[PDB]
């Protein structure tokens, strides 16, 4: 069972009056609910749909369209490396290999215990600076396959 907390419901209701249409707060409501819990559970869809005033179908379409609104159980510290043209050139492949050799998983999976999900991301908009990756909200650039272990040991 799912029910919206008081803090996140209040934040959604405060976001709903930044726009002319309540619907417009849908992405921000999903991001609030995800911030609190790490992902958007199946009941959060209907809860947000009841708070805003739009159906659960629209909220579920918004949540499954965008790639940073997780609809499946994701660990903590959702690692997102970049694999686009500028990074492909700078060698993000070695960075992905040293990441999935240390986490012992494949891109798209949790590790064992609910920490260090591994995902690829479109581009982090920091191309001139080596292969990049974000862990949760910290952008890490100039990545070297030697410094992946020590950089992962900072997140517990």
């Amino acid at each position: 069972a799912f029910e919206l907390s008081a803090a996140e419901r209040e934040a959604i209701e405060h976001e709903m009056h930044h726009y002319e249409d309540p619907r417009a707060a849908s992405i921000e409501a999903l991001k609030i609910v995800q911030k609190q819990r790490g992902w958007v559970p199946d009941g959060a869809i209907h809860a947000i749909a009841d708070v805003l005033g739009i159906p659960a179908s629209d909220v579920e379409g918004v949540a499954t369209f965008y790639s940073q609104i997780f609809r499946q159980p994701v660990g903590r510290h959702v690692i997102r490396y970049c694999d686009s043209v500028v990074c492909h050139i700078n060698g993000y492949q070695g960075i992905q290999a040293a990441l999935e050799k240390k986490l012992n998983i494949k891109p798209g999976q949790t590790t064992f215990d609910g920490r260090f999900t591994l995902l690829p991301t479109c581009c982090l908009g920091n191309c001139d600076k080596g292969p990049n990756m974000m862990i949760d909200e910290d952008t890490h650039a100039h990545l070297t396959p030697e410094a992946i272990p020590e950089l992962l040991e900072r997140y517990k």
Binding site: E60, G61, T64, F65
Partner: protein, 226 residues
Amino acid sequence: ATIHVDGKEYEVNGADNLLEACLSLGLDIPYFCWHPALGSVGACRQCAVKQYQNAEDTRGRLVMSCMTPASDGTFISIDDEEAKQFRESVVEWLMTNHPHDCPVCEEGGNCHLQDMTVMTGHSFRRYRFTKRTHRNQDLGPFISHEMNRCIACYRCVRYYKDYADGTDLGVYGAHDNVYFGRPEDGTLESEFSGNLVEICPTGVFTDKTHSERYNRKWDMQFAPSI
């Protein structure tokens, strides 16, 4: 109100799109996402016709019939080689991911996708790779759900939500993995959901009441009743 289609000169209502006017004149243009009740959206890209100007532009540009205003000084050509090839390749792209199951589809001899595939003259598969697959939902005791056969034309969603105001059907996902169904298994609440069995051009939504005791369209015997 006087368009030129392949040299011929017709008289049309200048207030509707070129697909509507050309279909009213009796010509044959393929189209998946247009419906004369749900307006025109340019999604499927399958009703492409070459459009010239000056009556002497020998190098027109491909444009969708359902989205051009069909004004007075309009010169198009449905049969242009480039337009033919694009319309054909457009169905080939849809056929890249289709399921090899016409024989077991609820609607053979009644499917619009079959009509348009035979119409665009495409009977050869160059695709070689895997097809995307989808899991079905339980939509009720009335209509079935086979998302493997979806061509993403958006007719179901447009009708069900913008026309009939359904509120429990939409589109999910993106990037060739798009999905059209309910947010969760369950019966469809809208009173007018049966029309999804004929709005959908493919055999994604097909009624169960006929699927139990099935018979191909040719075998049926109809009569005008109320």
